[PDB]
């Protein structure tokens, strides 16, 4: 019964902090924002980094990533955003990586745990991912010691 | 002596004394009381619950 068309190991998604998205023919994997936090909100003007991996499903042609827009600020793409035929396009350097990067200039406060919409277009698609804020291998921030009460 | 009133208001609350079954640890004792979602550190004493 559990080995039928509806399985519990085939429908299982990725156990990470990213979002799986399909931009027509390019698959977006582990889409997350890296943003160290100190206060409840990340104030506007703070520079954060958007990290994801673009996979080209088609193995015949190539694709190039342009015009990443979101309602959190301005997103700047630096480097060769062209994905090969049957290769990957890794943008940013996540923790545990021993050069294309996405730079975001905030205009409104953001915080961990919420979802913020992002638009990804390469040549034949306009899809929304709702990118969250994910913390990598950073250690737990210290908590002030409470008093006697 | 064994009989006790289940609904006797004995628990302080922001809107007067209430019964035990209607309240819990998350019930505010006054308006605007801050209750933190503290985690159990697993050690006895020395801040067993932290922010």
């Amino acid at each position: 019964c559990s080995a039928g068309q509806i399985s519990q190991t085939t429908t299982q998604e990725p156990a990470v902090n990213g979002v799986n998205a399909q931009a027509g023919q390019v698959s977006l994997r582990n889409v997350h924002l890296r943003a160290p936090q100190q206060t409840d909100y990340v104030e506007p003007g703070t520079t954060v980094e958007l990290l994801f991996v673009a996979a080209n499903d088609s193995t015949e042609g190539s694709n190039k990533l342009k015009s990443i827009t979101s309602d959190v600020g301005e997103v700047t793409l630096t480097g060769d955003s062209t994905v090969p035929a049957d290769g990957v396009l890794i943008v940013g350097e996540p923790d545990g990586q021993i050069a294309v990067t996405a730079e975001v200039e905030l205009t409104k406060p953001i915080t961990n745990g919420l979802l913020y919409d992002f638009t990804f277009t390469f040549e034949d698609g306009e899809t929304t991912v709702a990118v969250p804020i994910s913390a990598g291998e950073q250690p737990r921030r210290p908590v002030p010691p409470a008093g006697p009460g | 002596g064994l009989i006790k009133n289940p609904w006797k208001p004995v628990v302080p609350t922001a809107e007067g004394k209430k019964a035990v079954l209607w309240t819990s640890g998350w019930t505010p004792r006054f308006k605007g009381e801050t209750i933190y979602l503290a985690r159990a550190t697993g050690r006895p004493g020395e801040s067993p619950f932290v922010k």
Partner: peptide, 25 residues
Amino acid sequence: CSPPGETASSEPGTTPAIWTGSPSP
């Protein structure tokens, strides 16, 4: 016998506001 007080809704909802914390405990 479905519980009357347990009905699903399609309302989207709003993001909760920042907690302030009243003084004088």
